[PDB]
RNA sequence: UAUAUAUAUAU
RNA sequence: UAUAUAUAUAU
């Protein structure tokens, strides 16, 4: 459907947009480009689990100063070191009104989900 | 809407029926008859607190013999003495049918929701 | 992602 | 009844 701004639900920075997110085992979110690489920050996970073919890692937060707000975590997925997002940590935007929508879950967020691709990477 | 039938998730037993059930301030509910009252029993309120027109008084429980399960509280609505309970202490069995729900929150019970009335008492 | 327990705040 | 934080269980 229509392509949204993620921003983050504290500072509202745009974090990234729909267009740019992919599901992985079709429930968890990660975000491709380098560009949303350049808004968060990670930090080693105080505790590391390993369940089904992720490896929590580290934990991702908003890089921008006076925030820092938690927005997931960071894994080894088959070979990839991705990050995994919460909706729970964004405002979604529709680009066109301005419309803000805060979702909690995302199974509410009913945008176009486009499957994970090894390809692609 | 359709009459059903309101059991103990615990112990299963018959608590009430939803034609006995009244909607208070939209958001709280009770249930009216002598027959109920037989069902449950309740000890005084370990935090009593007084809210926009209710002073929570006690805790009632299924009174059945070895379940005494948790069903809500007792307190005193106006010049009226009446229970209220959580929908997700109970099954909500369909007598036509048989089948059975699990509700969490009353919202997303959809039944006949009569108000409350000080006439009826 | 989800399940469960626990206090704390509001009417 | 609604919200917020906190630990444990699961994949
Ligand atoms: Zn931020
Ligand atoms: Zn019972």
Chains 1, 2 share one sequence.
């Not at 529709?94 to 199974?107: E, F, M, N, P, R």
Request: aromatic share 14%; glycine share 2%; net charge positive.
């Amino acid at each position: 459907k229509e392509n949204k701004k993620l921003l983050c639900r504290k500072c509202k920075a745009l974090a990234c947009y729909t267009a740019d997110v992919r599901v992985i085992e079709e429930s968890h979110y990660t975000v491709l480009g380098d560009a949303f690489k350049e808004c968060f920050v990670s930090r080693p996970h105080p505790k590391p689990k390993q369940f089904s073919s992720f490896e929590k890692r580290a934990k991702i937060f908003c890089a921008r100063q006076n925030c820092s707000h938690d927005w997931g975590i960071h894994v080894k997925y088959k070979t990839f070191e991705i990050p995994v997002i919460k909706i729970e940590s964004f405002v979604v935007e529709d680009i066109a009104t301005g419309v803000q929508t805060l979702y909690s879950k995302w199974k509410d967020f009913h945008f176009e989900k486009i499957p994970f691709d090894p390809a692609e990477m």
